Every structure is written in C-alpha cells, then in structure tokens.
C-alpha cells in the first residue's frame, strides 16, 4: 500500500539503463543548446522546434525528479544536499524553459527583470548538472 509501488518505481529508477539514458539525455540537452545557439537567423518555426525539444527534455527531468522524490519519500530524499541541489537545478531550469518556450506572453505578470541573465543562468545550470555526476 504505497511503499510497495514506491518500491517498483525505484526498481526502475535505480537501474543502470535508466541511470545512463538519463545521463545521455543530459548530453543531448546541452548539444541541442549549442546547435540552437549556433544557427544564424533561424525562423520562428525553426526556433519553435528547438524550443520544443528543450521543453520535451526539461519535462522528462521533471518527472524523473518527481519519482526520486516519490521513490524514497519526501522526508528522506530532501536531507541529502547533493540531491536537493540537483532537484532545485532541475526546477529552476524548467521554469525558465517553460516561460521561454510556452508562457512568454505571461512573463510580465511575474514582474521578473533580468530575463537575459536568467536564461544564461539556466543554460549554465545544465552544465553544472554534470559537475554533480562527476563525483557520483
């Protein structure tokens, strides 16, 4: 009753195949970003496509996170800094990406300033992600 499924999810989440394919998605996400930043004068149609692919990935990491929080339970997952870090990072990156790609008409209602720097911040956090993996 709960702790059971919370066990099957980990029996998948833990696995090397999903530990690695999630690592492969991180490289993919960065590669994407480089291409996106290197193509001169791409149309809005093309931009929507690269924005779509960044959001797709960002959403995946959001689910992965919502299970590693569900698979060890909130209380237990929260304690490890090397995990809360990674999760915070995932969220921040997702919020930036969601507004960039989907909710931009409504960005003024956040009252946020320094949009350009928040975007740059979010791109760097995707690289910082691997700087946690490197210790493992």
């Amino acid at each position, epitope marked *: 009753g709960v702790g059971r499924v919370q066990f099957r999810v980990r029996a998948v989440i833990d696995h090397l195949g999903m530990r690695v394919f999630g690592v492969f998605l991180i490289f993919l996400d960065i590669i994407l970003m480089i291409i996106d930043l290197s193509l001169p004068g791409k149309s809005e149609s093309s931009q929507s496509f690269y924005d779509g692919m960044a959001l797709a990935l960002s959403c995946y990491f959001m689910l992965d996170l919502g299970l590693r929080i569900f698979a060890y339970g909130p209380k237990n997952f929260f304690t490890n800094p090397w995990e809360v870090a990674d999760g915070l990072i995932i969220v921040v990156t997702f919020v930036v990406t969601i507004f960039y790609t989907v909710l*931009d*008409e409504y*960005v*003024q*209602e956040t*009252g*946020a*300033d*320094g*949009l*350009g*720097e*928040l975007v740059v911040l979010a791109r760097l956090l995707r690289v910082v992600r691997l700087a946690r993996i490197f210790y493992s």
Partner: antibody, heavy 119, light 108 residues
C-alpha cells in the same frame, strides 16, 4: 544615495577627441552596468555604449563603433567614454546611466554633459 | 535594430483624463520594455520596467501593459506635473532602442 556625475563635455573640432567621465556614488561600477545614451538637440534618445565589468563585457552602437571606447576604473568607481574622430552628427547631450546588470532596465540617469562638434 | 514604433507623437489632455501611449516592437522582446519620462532640460526617469512593473516611488497613476509586441503606457489620472516627453525602450536585444517619444501637453 545613488549618484552619477558626468564631466568632460565641451566644444571640439571635427576630427578631434574628447574624454567624458562619470563618477559613481551609491553602488559599485564593478558589479553593475554603465551606459552612455545621447540626445541630439530637439531629438530622441540613442544608446551609445555599455560596460558590464563583471563579465569583461562592453558593447557599442554601430554609429560609434571604432571611434568610441567605454571603460571603467573600479577603484575610482568611475566610468569613461573616450571619443575620437568626432563628427558634426556626434553633437548631443551625453548621459551616463546605470542598470543592475546588462539584462536589467536602466534605472538611474545622470544630468548629462553637452558635446558640441564644430569648427 | 528592433524598431519601437510609438504613437501618438504628441497629445493634449485635461487634468484627471486617462491618457494612453502605445509602442509596437518590430518583433517579440518578451517583457523587456521600459518606460521613461523626460521633463525639459532634465535627464529621463524610469517609470515602468518589465513592461508592467511600477518602479519604486513612482505614482500609481502610471501603469504599463502589454499584449504580444504591443506595449501601452497609461496615465490614468493626468496631473499637471505630467507634462513631459515619454519614451518606450526595448532592452531585450542589442542595440537597446527607443521609440521616438510622445510629447504630453496639459490642457487648461
């Protein structure tokens, strides 16, 4: 307590040179963005240049690229606009201004200094 | 080279009137638009940043809104000290660009 006091404006001959300076109080030039914006008499506002020292980052309008150079002395908390090969069309009030950083709105402007390019 | 097309170029309104100034960006700039008020012989002052956030200490009579690439400064209760030139500005792309300004005259 935020202040921007600019000086160095004046009459200069076409081809001549001028150096404006902007003394900053109330914040660090080293971690903020400084801007120069100009206004020809009876006209609108034209962004000229920016420095965000924290990123080693300066930027220029094409209308002044190669002739103007913006910089900062973090120890004097002062910014500078070196202006060479001046032309008639460069005549304007030059304002120094600041934002929290490069992607933030300019939030304070000094009262500016008048530059007159004429023989 | 983002063009900010600002209209009207000038207007005249009574004390207490609602005044609207429109800026259209040539392409999307998110919410990176600021509004400035410049009184004669003075340097500009920031009124609104991020399209719709009121800058600290500015009277609430000034508000900014946007819809897509269309930006509006509204002065909802014109005061006689509001005589000025108002400029929109985008700061999302380099170079930062300004609209041509709107000269506001108080009708008495």
């Amino acid at each position: 307590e935020v202040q921007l006091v600019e000086s160095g404006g004046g009459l200069v001959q076409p081809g001549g040179s001028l150096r404006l300076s902007c003394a900053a109080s109330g914040f660090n030039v080293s971690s903020s963005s400084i801007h120069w914006v100009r206004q020809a008499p009876g006209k609108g506002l034209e962004w000229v240049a920016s420095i965000s020292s924290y990123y080693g980052y300066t930027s220029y309008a094409d209308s002044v690229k190669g002739r103007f150079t913006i910089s900062a002395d973090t120890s004097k908390n002062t910014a500078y606009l070196q202006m060479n090969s001046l032309r008639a069309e460069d005549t304007a009030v030059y304002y120094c201004a600041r934002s929290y950083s490069w992607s933030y709105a300019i939030d304070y402007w000094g009262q500016g200094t008048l530059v007159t390019v004429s023989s | 080279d983002i063009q900010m097309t600002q209209s009207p170029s000038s207007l005249s309104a009574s004390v207490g009137d609602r005044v609207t100034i429109t800026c259209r960006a040539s392409q999307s700039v998110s919410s990176a638009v600021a509004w400035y008020q410049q009184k004669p012989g003075k340097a500009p002052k920031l009124l609104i940043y991020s399209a719709s956030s009121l800058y600290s200490g500015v009277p609430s009579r000034f508000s900014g809104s946007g819809s897509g690439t269309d930006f509006t400064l509204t002065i909802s209760s014109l005061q006689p000290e509001d005589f000025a030139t108002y400029y929109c500005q985008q700061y999302f792309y380099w170079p930062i660009t300004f609209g041509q300004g709107t000269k506001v005259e108080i009708k008495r």
